[PDB]
Curated annotation (Swiss-Prot):
Subunit record text: Monomer.
Main location: membrane
Topological region Cytoplasmic: 1-10, 55-61, 113-117, 171-180
Known function: Calcium channel that probably plays a role in the regulation of calcium homeostasis. Uptakes calcium ions and mediates calcium flux in proteoliposomes in a pH-dependent manner. When expressed in E.coli in the presence of high extracellular calcium concentrations, shows calcium-leak activity, increasing intracellular calcium concentration. It can also mediate Ca(2+) flux from the endoplamic reticulum (ER) when expressed in permeabilized mammalian cells. Calcium transport activity is also detected in ER-like lipid vesicles.
CDD domains: BI-1-like_bacterial
Keywords: Calcium, Calcium transport, Cell membrane, Ion transport, Membrane, Transmembrane, Transmembrane helix, Transport
Catalytic activity: Ca(2+)(in) = Ca(2+)(out)
UniProt cross-references to Pfam families, sorted A to Z: Bax1-I (PF01027)
GO BP annotation list: calcium ion transport; regulation of proteolysis
Organism: Bacillus subtilis (strain 168)
Subcellular compartments: Cell membrane
N-terminal signal peptide: none
Protein name, as recorded: pH-sensitive calcium channel
């Protein structure tokens, strides 16, 4: 018989694992010739679209989640290398670092606070759409540095709030073992999409 503690710990474990796997993929992305990479904006919004799309009640397997972690890790290298070529490799750490701590804070706060935050859902969903919208817009009408930067601040706020909300709901809601893969998947999607926004923010800022 599973407890909320065991399910908590398990989702976190799977999550951390997706981080490691995606990291490996990120290492694999550097050995891909530049003639086979996807456009920056396309990937940047792809991550958002996936961040939203994979927020359903359809229980996928650990296989799908880990597979996705690997391939997304691979495909997020062109983003990393870009904001590294314009702002020094150090920023790649910086953003990551920041991301980590944020996830570690709200993720702890929501998972311990007694206020049920269900009422947020709709808004959050809406928020993502807007970002996605702008993202799509960014494909057909590239935004300047300042607008992209404000977009990055917005994205940061949204995905941080989404981290807090997600942990809060993992504790508050009825989550069974079959839901463990899909939960740690979203947790992975928040981390990645927050990191992107921070890397885009500080990467542009230090140019």
């Amino acid at each position: 018989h599973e407890s909320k503690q065991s399910i908590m710990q398990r989702i976190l474990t799977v999550f951390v694992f997706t981080l490691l796997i995606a990291t490996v993929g990120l290492f694999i992305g550097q050995f891909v010739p530049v003639a086979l990479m996807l456009p920056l904006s396309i990937l940047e919004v792809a991550m958002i679209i996936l961040a939203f799309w994979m927020r359903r009640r359809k229980a996928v397997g650990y296989a799908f989640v880990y597979t996705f972690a690997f391939v997304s890790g691979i495909t997020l290298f062109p983003i990393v290398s870009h904001y590294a070529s314009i702002a020094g490799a150090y920023v790649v750490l910086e953003a990551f670092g920041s991301t980590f701590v944020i996830f570690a804070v709200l993720g702890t706060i929501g998972a311990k606070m007694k206020k049920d935050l269900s009422f947020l859902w709709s808004f959050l969903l809406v928020a993502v759409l807007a970002l996605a919208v702008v993202g799509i817009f960014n494909i057909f009408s590239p935004l300047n540095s300042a607008a992209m930067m404000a977009y990055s601040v917005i994205g940061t706020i949204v995905f941080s709030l989404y981290i807090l909300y997600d942990l809060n709901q993992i504790k508050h809601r009825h989550i069974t073992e079959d839901l463990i893969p899909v939960m740690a998947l979203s947790l992975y999607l928040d981390f990645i999409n927050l990191f992107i926004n921070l890397l885009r923010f500080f990467g542009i800022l230090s140019s």
